[PDB]
C-alpha cells in the first residue's frame, strides 16, 4: 500500500518521484490510525504513499507526533493533515489539497475538480493565443491566493476544440474570451432541490 | 421587425412557422404600445413576430382589446401578456414564457439556457438508450412543476458523443448515468479579488 521509508533519502526520493506525494508518519505501524492511513493509501493509485516510524525522518519534516503530510511540486509545497486519522478524513484531506491553486481544465483534471469540497468555482475562459496570456493568468493566480479553501479557480483554454461545448454551455463565443463565470455546484429529486436551496 | 397580418390565415401560418411565435394585437400600428412592441420585436432574434389591426384576428384569438400573445408548440400552448405595454415588460414576458418546462440541452437551446433569468439549474443526464426513458423524464417534469420560476429544469443525452466534455465537467462517466446535478450561475488581479468578494 505504502512504501516503508527507513531513512531521509528514501523520503526525499519518494517526494521527488511524483507531482503529488503523501507520507504517513506513524511510530507504531500496527496502530489503528496507521491502518486507516494504509487503507487511504490503497484507495488512491494516482499518488504514491510512504510510511515511516523513524524519528529522524519525523524530525526532518518537523513532526514530533504521528501525522500525515501531503507534498506537492507547486504552490505552498506541502499541507499537514489536521484532526482524527480516519480513511474518510484522509481522502477528504487529499482531495482538498491535491489540486494546484489555479487549475487547468483537462481530461485528467476534471474528476478531481468535482472531487473538491469547494462549492463555489470561478471559471476563466482564457485563449492560449491571447495577448499577455501569462500576465492575465498570473492575475488570476494572484487573486486565487486570498481565496484558498473558499473558491476554486479554474481556467479553460478557449482555443481548444474540446472546450467549445463548455463555451456553449455558458453561452460564450470564442471572441467573447477572456471571460469570467462564477458558479456554485451542488422524483426523489424534489428533495435534492430543497437541500440545495 | 414584425410581419403584418391582415387575415386569420396569415396569423395561423405565422404561429405554425415556429416553435414559439408572438403576435401583437393593435388597432393602431403607430400607437405608443404598438411602437413599444415593435421595439421588443427587434430585440429578440430567436422568435418571429406578427402584428395585426384586424378585429377578426382579435376575436379569432379571443382578444377584445389590444394585447400581446405568445404562442408555443409545447406545454400550455399560449400565454397572454398582462400589464403595461413597455419594451422592457414585453422582453420580461417572453423570456419567462419562451422555453419549455423541461428543456433539452441542444445547440440551438444552449444560448437560451445561460441567458435565462432563473440562474439556478438542475441537469438531468438522461441517456436516450435508457429503459423507461419517458417514464424517467416524466418524473423530472413532475418535479419541474414544484419549482417553476425557481429552478430551470434541463435534460442532456448522456449517450451522445458531443456531450462528453459536459459529462467530464460534472465529474460523470457514461455508466454512472442517469444522474443529476444542480448548479447556480452567478456574477486585472484586483478586479477579480473585488468581484470575488461577493460573499457578503
Curated annotation (Swiss-Prot), chain A:
Disease entry from the Swiss-Prot or TrEMBL record: Cole-Carpenter syndrome 1: A form of Cole-Carpenter syndrome, a disorder characterized by features of osteogenesis imperfecta such as bone deformities and severe bone fragility with frequent fractures, in association with craniosynostosis, ocular proptosis, hydrocephalus, growth failure and distinctive facial features. Craniofacial findings include marked frontal bossing, midface hypoplasia, and micrognathia. Despite the craniosynostosis and hydrocephalus, intellectual development is normal. CLCRP1 inheritance is autosomal dominant.
Residue numbers of the full-length protein present here: 136 to 347 of 508
Family: Belongs to the protein disulfide isomerase family.
Misc. remarks from the entry: Reduces and may activate fusogenic properties of HIV-1 gp120 surface protein, thereby enabling HIV-1 entry into the cell.
Gene of this entry: P4HB
Assembly information from the UniProt record: Heterodimer; heterodimerizes with the protein microsomal triglyceride transfer MTTP. Homodimer. Monomers and homotetramers may also occur. Interacts with P4HA2, forming a heterotetramer consisting of 2 alpha subunits (P4HA2) and 2 beta (P4HB), where P4HB plays the role of a structural subunit; this tetramer catalyzes the formation of 4-hydroxyproline in collagen. Also constitutes the structural subunit of the microsomal triacylglycerol transfer protein MTTP in mammalian cells. Stabilizes both enzymes and retain them in the ER without contributing to the catalytic activity. Binds UBQLN1.
Organism field: Homo sapiens
Function: This multifunctional protein catalyzes the formation, breakage and rearrangement of disulfide bonds. At the cell surface, seems to act as a reductase that cleaves disulfide bonds of proteins attached to the cell. May therefore cause structural modifications of exofacial proteins. Inside the cell, seems to form/rearrange disulfide bonds of nascent proteins. At high concentrations and following phosphorylation by FAM20C, functions as a chaperone that inhibits aggregation of misfolded proteins. At low concentrations, facilitates aggregation (anti-chaperone activity).
Superkingdom, taxonomy of origin: Eukaryota
Modification after translation, per record: It also promotes interaction with ERN1.
Name of this protein: Protein disulfide-isomerase
Residue(s) carrying N6-acetyllysine: 65
Cellular compartments annotated: Endoplasmic reticulum; Endoplasmic reticulum lumen; Melanosome; Cell membrane
Chain positions with N6-succinyllysine modification: 87, 136
